[PDB]
Amino acid sequence: SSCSSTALSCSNSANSDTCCSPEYGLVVLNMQWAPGYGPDNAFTLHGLWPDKCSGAYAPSGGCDSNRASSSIASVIKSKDSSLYNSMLTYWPSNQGNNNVFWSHEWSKHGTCVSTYDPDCYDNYEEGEDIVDYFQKAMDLRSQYNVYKAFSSNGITPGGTYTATEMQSAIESYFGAKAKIDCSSGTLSDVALYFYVRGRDTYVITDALSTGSCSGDVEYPTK
């Protein structure tokens, strides 16, 4: 009875049961501002990537080949219609091929979250782990609203802002530095770094890099 909840990944208190404390203890939530994809008032998801505590990446081919998949859109569609519909809105592939995008994120990163290993479920049915993972990430993109962090500090779409004011809004709103990346001086992605308390309560921590945005950054309308 229990999954030891004060356990914090990357600390002297992580319990060795990889079903109750993630093996890749440092996780980054990568969200992007792609014009033409998702709501006007929201960053959409790129992925939830588990990393080593030193920030080193996990195996580039994922961590469970037997669990890799190139059919993630029909697996989610059949296990959960609502989760499939939310993903079309909040996790669109900015390259017009959702199934290849979601299959890559599941295979390379999803297999590396040990709390969703099938041996952790006391009564497992196929596809349980996949839905837990896509749902945990969607929830985090919702709960960590970067668009609200910027607007509340007067940074809205369709303006030129300084990278410096952008970091203060993320820093003051969430209490941690994020990795803000630009492409040709236009904002493109924002990533938030985390630690896990117990099985899956994310605790934010400072990004291990402030990112490529520097100077005046354009924040376009979607």
From Swiss-Prot:
Its EC number is 4.6.1.19. GO terms for biological process: RNA catabolic process. InterPro entries: Ribonuclease_T2_eukaryotic, RNase_T2-like, RNase_T2-like_sf, RNase_T2_His_AS_1, RNase_T2_His_AS_2. It catalyses: a ribonucleotidyl-ribonucleotide-RNA + H2O = a 3'-end 3'-phospho-ribonucleotide-RNA + a 5'-end dephospho-ribonucleoside-RNA + H(+). Disulfide bonds join 3-20, 10-53, 19-120, 63-112, 182-213. Gene3D superfamilies: Ribonuclease T2-like. SUPFAM superfamilies: Ribonuclease Rh-like. GO terms for molecular function: ribonuclease T2 activity; RNA binding. Keywords: Disulfide bond, Endonuclease, Hydrolase, Lyase, Nuclease, Signal. The active site is at 46, 105, 109. Pfam families: Ribonuclease_T2. GO terms for cellular component: extracellular region. It comes from the Eukaryota. PANTHER family: RIBONUCLEASE T2 (PTHR11240:SF22). Belongs to the RNase T2 family. This is a base non-specific ribonuclease. This is Ribonuclease Rh. It comes from Rhizopus niveus. The lineage of its organism: Eukaryota, Fungi, Fungi incertae sedis, Mucoromycota, Mucoromycotina.
